[PDB]
Copies of this chain bind each other. A is one copy, B any other.
Amino acid sequence: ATKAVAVLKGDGPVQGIINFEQKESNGPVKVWGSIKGLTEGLHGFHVHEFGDNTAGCTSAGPHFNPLSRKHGGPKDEERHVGDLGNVTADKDGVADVSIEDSVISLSGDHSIIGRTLVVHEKADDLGKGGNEESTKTGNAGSRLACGVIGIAQ
């Protein structure tokens, strides 16, 4: 898959469309798009294991983590594959997302296709917060909106 897409929808204001592009299977993938209805500031943004939205964002499970690593930030080695960090929402509550990541992929074992993109209530502390939650979730709070990552063109 050179391209994927996810429509984030939630039980509330937050919604947005996020796009993933991988030009070759070994390449970095770029994730760009808009999330709306956020509060201003930092919000955790991750790919969660399951593409299951039967119980909303809660059925997606924990961060996608094929390597059984601990939680980190995108630049950390000790991170989970789905740790894309934070995205910032401006004053109008809008996140113009722009991330480039080389751990996640749209093909093979680290494929994020069919899994869930989630945008969180609070900032992800990037595993630097010094308590067990930090290394699990990054203390990023609830899942405001989520969507299953699907194949695009």
Binding site for B on A (CB under 8 A): 1, 4-5, 7, 17, 49-54, 59, 61, 113-116, 147-153
Contacts and interface: CB of A to CB of B under 8 A. Distances in A.
A147 B17 CA distance: 15
B52 A114 contact: no
Given A4-B51, A50-B150, A114-B148, 18 more contacts: A5-B51, A5-B52, A5-B53, A5-B54, A17-B54, A49-B151, A50-B151, A50-B153, A51-B149, A51-B150, A52-B151, A52-B152, A53-B147, A53-B150, A54-B152, A114-B149, A114-B150, A114-B151
Nearest to A149: B114
Quick one: copies of this chain in the complex? 2
A115 B54 contact: no
